[PDB]
Amino acid sequence: GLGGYMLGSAMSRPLIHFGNDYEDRYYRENMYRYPNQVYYRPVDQYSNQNNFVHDCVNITVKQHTVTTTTKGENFTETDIKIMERVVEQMCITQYQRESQAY
Amino acid sequence: DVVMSQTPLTLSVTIGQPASISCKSSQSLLDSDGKTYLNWLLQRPGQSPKRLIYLVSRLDSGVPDRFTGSGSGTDFTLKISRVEAEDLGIYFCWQGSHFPQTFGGGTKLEIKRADAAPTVSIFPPSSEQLTSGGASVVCFLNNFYPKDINVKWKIDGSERQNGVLNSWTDQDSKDSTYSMSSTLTLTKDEYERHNSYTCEATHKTSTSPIVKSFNRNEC
Amino acid sequence: QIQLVQSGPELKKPGETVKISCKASGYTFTNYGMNLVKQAPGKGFEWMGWINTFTGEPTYADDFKGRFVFSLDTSASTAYLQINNLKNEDTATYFFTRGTDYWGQGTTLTVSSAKTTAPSVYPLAPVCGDTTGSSVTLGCLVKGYFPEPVTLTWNSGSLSSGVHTFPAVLQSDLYTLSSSVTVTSSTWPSQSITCNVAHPASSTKVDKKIEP
């Protein structure tokens, strides 16, 4: 499950750009439904950024949808689409943080 | 423990008309994560609940714009701008914002339809039951409307209440009517001590009772 | 095809245990949290808690953090609700839900020292309106059984139109239920109309054709 995973501190949601003013307007009006912090394993447990990141995205996303759908939610193809993109940026930033403090 | 107060208990509406349902929680439903987890579900007769709206106003796929959810803090409203056949059933809110989650009492939504006199059928005890020393006289009063109805049993002309058990179905999805089942059970000894058995229904569609009866003497 | 199929009806004695299961399918099991709801007879819904399908960690509402256990068999997409040291208060129908949108059919649990009593099924043939409307109504009477629930169908489920199966009624310490089916004056006795019943609690299943 979440064995050995740490909850990172909250951060600003990354402003990810989409050309169509619709998806943008959608991410903006829906980011409150997405995470603003992530789950990660100590960085000394990965060989590179891509491994830390891939692992971080799957865990953060999963935990988020199971705990939020419990209270009442619905994540479409678009919601998942957007979430993985945003969480990935946050995971890469969480990576920078971890390696910087080492 | 947040208490969800849903009103009204029942609603009777004409197709095409609007319907409003209310859910007020004892405490604010704004969750710590900034969201407001207020859900609206629909439980059709015989079916298990199905969610129509989540997060106060978001529609689940398939749900018509006819349905809208609004409110915030403690006042929430489920609205149907134009009600219709398929909508009949029990509605209720469910809040997931605080531990423990709580449900509203529910609002039974009745869809009005033209009046229908009950179809009445009376059944003498089955042979196989008269061998066990018991006797049951079953009477069905099916597909009527409005729901208000009253059944009365008479043995040789005397009203009989002892031993009567009734059961009513919810509003039907197909023809939106109601049905009733009334069963009079007595001992075979007694059953054989009387002749005519009558089932009388008092319903708006008739000023005089809608009777159905038989004579034990198979006459 | 998103479905939650819960285990069947249960009859237990005060003190025994029950492990109710819910087999899920039609979606990614571990992406949705699961809730457990209780509904006492004629009462509203009561939230028992939830399970994190990803971590497996269960969380119980105060009234259930004593004798209730929520578990999973992730590989099989199955959730479990176990109730230990059963009490009469535990009598009710329990449901598993996918978050807040989908529900299972629910499973009815009865806890009482009383012993299972199979139902008696009597057919019901006409004797009134012959063809004053060309319609025919027949019935089937199920009485004196314990406990809830029972299952009824006409001709194995091949006949579900013009059928009315009413809610069972607690007579003494026994339930009674009836059902009726209306058909065209021709269709009967021309064709066979049989009544099907099953009382899980008492491993019972019976039939009873309807004849003039």
Swiss-Prot record, chain A:
Disulfide bonds join 56-91. Glycans are attached at residues 58, 74. It is found in: Cell membrane; Golgi apparatus. Changing residue 10 to V: In scrapie; short incubation; sA allele. It comes from the Eukaryota. Monomer and homodimer. Has a tendency to aggregate into amyloid fibrils containing a cross-beta spine, formed by a steric zipper of superposed beta-strands. Soluble oligomers may represent an intermediate stage on the path to fibril formation. Copper binding may promote oligomerization. Interacts with GRB2, APP, ERI3/PRNPIP and SYN1. Mislocalized cytosolically exposed PrP interacts with MGRN1; this interaction alters MGRN1 subcellular location and causes lysosomal enlargement. Interacts with KIAA1191. Belongs to the prion family. This protein is produced by a bicistronic gene which also produces the major prion protein/PRNP from an overlapping reading frame. The alternative prion protein/AltPrP (AC F7VJQ3) and PRNP have no apparent direct functional relation since a mutation that removes the start codon of the AltPrP has no apparent effect on the biology of PRNP. In mouse and hamster, the alternative initiation AUG codon is absent and is replaced by a GUG codon. Its primary physiological function is unclear. Has cytoprotective activity against internal or environmental stresses. May play a role in neuronal development and synaptic plasticity. May be required for neuronal myelin sheath maintenance. May play a role in iron uptake and iron homeostasis. Soluble oligomers are toxic to cultured neuroblastoma cells and induce apoptosis (in vitro). Association with GPC1 (via its heparan sulfate chains) targets PRNP to lipid rafts. Also provides Cu(2+) or Zn(2+) for the ascorbate-mediated GPC1 deaminase degradation of its heparan sulfate side chains. It is linked to Found in high quantity in the brain of humans and animals infected with degenerative neurological diseases such as kuru, Creutzfeldt-Jakob disease (CJD), Gerstmann-Straussler syndrome (GSS), scrapie, bovine spongiform encephalopathy (BSE), transmissible mink encephalopathy (TME), etc. The normal, monomeric form has a mainly alpha-helical structure. The disease-associated, protease-resistant form forms amyloid fibrils containing a cross-beta spine, formed by a steric zipper of superposed beta-strands. Disease mutations may favor intermolecular contacts via short beta strands, and may thereby trigger oligomerization. This is Major prion protein. It comes from Ovis aries (Sheep). The chain holds residues 127 to 228 of 256 of the full protein.
